[PDB]
Symmetry: C5
Subunit: 253 residues, 5 copies
């Protein structure tokens, strides 16, 4: 919300990094990174999901040295090879076979901003009764199933904003860059790439990156990798942490 | 250099020569009742081609909106006319994560499993133009009897199942032009840019990307964007995301809104 | 610099040195009756290779059209030919496959109809002369029906490459797609593009946009040169199989639009 | 200073007759189990124990190769600069009436689908291959050339298994790959896609050229005025009405442009 | 300009090339089944998950000695790599051992979850541990996250390791650490699912440049280059229905140049 002047040159650069843990629901102390098992077939009139079943967006505020302009990010999902454990817990694919890989709907999303991520609410079912401890669209209507401009939120709390209720708001986020891919379907294969050679440039069309208000950088993520199928046939979301390395420079304003 | 039936001259320059407009365009999937905004009526199947009378609320339609822009041409005898020229669009489908609700209404994938994701045939389409989108009609079945309140190819013939050049329409009404009957007309739309992808099949995964970093340039090969006739910008969309499968096995289309942010500049015309 | 049996000289410039033509080319899927334009006859299956006699209406064919261009060389006192420089093309009516209420087998009890899916072939060509084809057969012993033009005097080698099987795409609804491909050993005066995707459950994936242009110039900057002021467009757009409530399957095809920009080229 | 094909590379020669083009096709070598089934393999056996795996020759697709003689020529050598290549006859797979198992009652025949391999090379000498086996104990049939004295290490990398692709219809595709530790005087390209239900995806166009020049601008140099083309185009499996499966292959077209290159003797 | 704990000066007989074929480490359950794992167990409770060593694919690594430079400072700088997976066509053997797809049909292709990964560095690859199940009891001869907690199922920064031993670091326990590896370049793709088709490309025309944004490649400490790989191609399904991982070797050709350092 400021007039942007010249990049400062000469201690004018800094780098910050974070590993941001996923918030899949964490149904007990041993099942960190998983959701509660999924319910199915609730009538739209009686759809009361349990909090531990709902993955939420992750976010962290990173303090910076006492404006900082975010210029690049390196990011990837951490622990993708853990899905090669087919011996623990997963339903056998057939008699004498190995366990079923994690697969199905997934969502991979990150943002880097100079302020909290701005979100827009959209619901599958406006009549869903969301559980205490979630932050979901207030006073939803049938219009909330399409676009209801009342549903604006800041991603200002961890393990609170359910991924199923909120998307990054393309009508705001003037001071953030976000990227997400949703792939839906029962049998969707997880496809995840890692490399330390790929950098995303955060500069806009005028060469200006996110400007860090109150010397704070905000990282946001959601990395729902797919569904884990237990021997019983029950399914749980599995998520993984996301790494960020952000390069910043001093910008005169 | 002729476009939008005017002679195109130079881009106008100076501080106030740019404007930006935005809108969220709601999907028109059929909206069978107040609870199922964003969905179609459940899908029928196996109608003989000779007795195919789909209900209106089962038929997704193209969405469109006319966005009024400032008049630029007060000075009638200056000799200089200006029109708004659309230069870029940022667009994405809104609410894609809503499909991660597998607890409400969807058939379980197997005993003790979660609900079935939305999947299957999908169509993602948008246009930005200086006039209504120009459409060409093509039917699966020329003998389909389309319901009151839809606008569909008039007096279709067997040729309407392939290319019948009689079926020209303007996308000039919301919740009227069924997506299954109409496509953007590549023989027209000289003053609009359109983009669509159809992916057909029972098990097709929805794949949707969001980012505020991606801009589509709307300039043609001569560097001219859509020119806004009557100081109007037209946005058009269809975002059928796939089929929702209820516990009963019934299927309904699910659609989502589309966001547009369009940057325009002043263009001199004769 | 030789192309289209002429020595290629300079590109001409000026307002009259460019022209544009357009065509919607209808598909030729077999058209088994007057109501099923754009479909084939239902598919037979399991014919022994020794007794494989497909019906004509079951066989999609390549489409082609000859487009007259503005007449050149109407003075006897320097030769010009039209040179095709760009094409815009797309398949027309792709959203018609969102009709899941008419005719198609339900996906499951209480469900909607089965989408068109399965093997597909999307192909076009732009040339200064008819498309040159090479014959290749699944089964050299296939007995093709009257009204089709198929490889003559085939042998087992016709299942791989038999150089006898050369044809021009010189007749509509005649050259079955399953028998012929564009000939990579010829077509020195045409540009062709095709993608075959085979399989029972292949999803049709089709894109439309008026922003995409294909350049038709070769490595020497020469486009197809239009013999006798004629441009040839060719297509095949088999979108997949339509499955009827009975389980019978029929090909579905769609028309292809072409918009071709040409310029005048001096030749000797 | 610039060394390739065991010669010092000097300047490209230009002018009248300093360029030539060769165009050819390679027929596929899928096994050809009888006179009528050119382009197919014998039906596939299944479930042989690794200790008793003796595939029949007609069941094994092999690499195709040919030596193309060039116009006879400080020495001059032909330098391969570009190749245009594509698979010939891809639309033949739209015949779903002949021989293939119906997909369901009253349905059409099952498309060819499943594991496929599409490969070509252009070189100034035979393609250099490295052997790798699924099962080192496989007993390969007379008329095939397969890794000699294989060991369990032959299932991963056994550096003993070096061969030249020096005979057509002899080197089974399942036994051999292009050797990335050699082929300094060839360019090769291949894609393997494995799986029962893999869709064949094949593109044809006469507008796509592959440049064969390396990072120093030198193409394959044709030793003894010979150009070597190699291919394998296993398109997938054909499923007969009985459920038996056979590989189907198609020919590959090549158009190669060459120029004269000066080299030191 | 600091990398590999040296000040990087100018690029400088100044070039060398090394190559390696790095064998896969899939578990090798007997003398005949080199390149395969032991058959996969399934449905172990998270509280009683004790995988056998021969069932666990591990990362491969090799230290490649380079010409000695400072005998009387220069370091080798890795500039490019050519790499590919070796023996991909071996999966066209559908006659040996694999379950028939249906009566009278050929054998089932190798398919399912796969992981293709390589790295080139001037020092061992730096790894971060992440577990499906922190309570997994890993077998003797494996090196797995020490003192695991439920946080080990997400990100536990305690789990740092060097890829400093072959056939030891299970692929399922470790990933390249994006918070380290300042002196290496790594690339990997995981594709998960029962029916995933293996898709593998070979060509001698593809080179990966290993220079960073400042034009500096990995700098080879102690005149050593480290190559690392994992190439789990998918699952082989036996006639009985049992499944085994199949892996293949990876080839590397690396071009290096001399770099002045202080």
């Amino acid at each position: 919300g400021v007039e942007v002047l010249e990049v400062k040159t000469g201690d004018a650069i800094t780098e910050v990094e974070c590993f941001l843990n996923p918030e899949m629901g964490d149904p007990d102390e041993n099942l960190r990174g998983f959701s509660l098992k999924l319910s199915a077939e609730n009538d739209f009139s009686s759809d009361s999901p349990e909090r531990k079943m709902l993955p939420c967006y992750s976010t962290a505020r990173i303090p910076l040295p006492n404006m900082w302009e975010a210029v690049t990010v390196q990011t990837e999902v951490i622990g993708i090879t853990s899905m090669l454990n087919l011996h623990a817990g997963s339903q056998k694919v057939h008699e004498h076979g190995g366990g079923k890989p994690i697969q199905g709907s997934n969502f991979h999303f990150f943002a880097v901003g100079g302020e909290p991520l701005e979100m827009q609410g959209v619901l599958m079912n406006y009549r869903s009764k969301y559980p205490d401890g979630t932050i979901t669209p207030k006073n939803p209507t049938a219009q909330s199933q399409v676009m209801n401009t009342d549903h604006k939120a800041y991603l200002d709390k961890n393990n609170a904003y359910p991924v199923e209720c909120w998307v990054p708001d393309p009508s705001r986020n003037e001071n953030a860059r976000y990227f997400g891919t949703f792939t839906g379907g029962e049998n969707v294969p997880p496809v995840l790439h890692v490399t330390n050679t790929a950098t995303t440039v955060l500069l806009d069309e005028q060469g200006v990156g996110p400007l860090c208000k109150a010397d704070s950088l905000y990282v946001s993520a959601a990395d729902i990798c797919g569904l884990f199928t237990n021997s019983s046939g029950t399914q749980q979301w599995r998520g993984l942490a996301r790494y960020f390395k952000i390069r910043l420079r001093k910008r005169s304003v």
